[PDB]
Amino acid sequence: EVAIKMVVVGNGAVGKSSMIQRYCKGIFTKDYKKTIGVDFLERQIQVNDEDVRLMLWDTAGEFDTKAYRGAQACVLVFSTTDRESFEAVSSWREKVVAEVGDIPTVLVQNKIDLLDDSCIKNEEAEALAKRLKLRFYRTSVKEDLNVNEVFKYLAEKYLQ
Ligand SMILES: Nc1nc2c(ncn2[C@@H]2O[C@H](COP(=O)(O)OP(=O)(O)NP(=O)(O)O)[C@@H](O)[C@H]2O)c(=O)[nH]1
Ligand SMILES: [Mg+2]
Numbered sequence: 324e325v326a327i328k329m330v331v332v333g334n335g336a337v338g339k340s341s342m343i344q345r346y347c348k349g350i351f352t353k354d355y356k357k358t359i360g361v362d363f364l365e366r367q368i369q370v371n372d373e374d375v376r377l378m379l380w381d382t383a384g385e386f387d388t389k390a391y392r393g394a395q396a397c398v399l400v401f402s403t404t405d406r407e408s409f410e411a412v413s414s415w416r417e418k419v420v421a422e423v424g425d426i427p428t429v430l431v432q433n434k435i436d437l438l439d440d441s442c443i444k445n446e447e448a449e450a451l452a453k454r455l456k457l458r459f460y461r462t463s464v465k466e467d468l469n470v471n472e473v474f475k476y477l478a479e480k481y482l483q
Contacts, residue, residue: 326376333400334408335384338433396477397428427480436463
């Protein structure tokens with residue numbers, strides 16, 4: 324079994340806790356203040372004929388921890404409806420690279436189901452991903468869209 328520690332990072336309310344709950348528990352609650360009462364949730368999947376245990380560590384939205392220590396892959400999340408969360412993506416990337424290193428990382432635009440209230444142009448987000456040289460996914464945690472693909476990509480890149 325290959326165990327992979329992954330950190331989910333991004334500005335407040337972009338959907339980090341919901342993303343981890345969706346992937347590891349298959350739920351999306353109407354909870355007001357969503358919280359994961361433990362350090363990480365996990366999901367054990369088969370990836371390219373191998374047993375993989377993905378351990379997903381939650382973080383706070385606290386820019387200067389045990390979550391980052393030893394991280395082996397990273398999900399950078401911003402929100403379709405939060406302009407500042409998009410503009411903060413480069414800084415979150417620098418924080419992970421400086422504190423952990425150049426680990427496999429995916430850029431995620433969450434809340435794509437709220438596209439009517441979008442404040443990020445498609446060209447803007449794609450151009451950012453190309454500048455940072457990061458795989459880019461548009462996800463909806465609420466509708467379970469492209470969440471599985473994000474973590475499967477990171478697992479595969481850590482293995483290969
Ligand atoms: N419409 C929609 N709402 C979403 C989606 N993902 C999360 N949310 C909602 O956005 C809110 C914030 O989500 P949450 O997971 O708490 O975000 P967070 O990044 O963990 N916040 P914090 O940094 O404060 O811990 C919640 O009301 C949650 O239900 C999504 O894909 N679509
Ligand atoms: Mg949270």
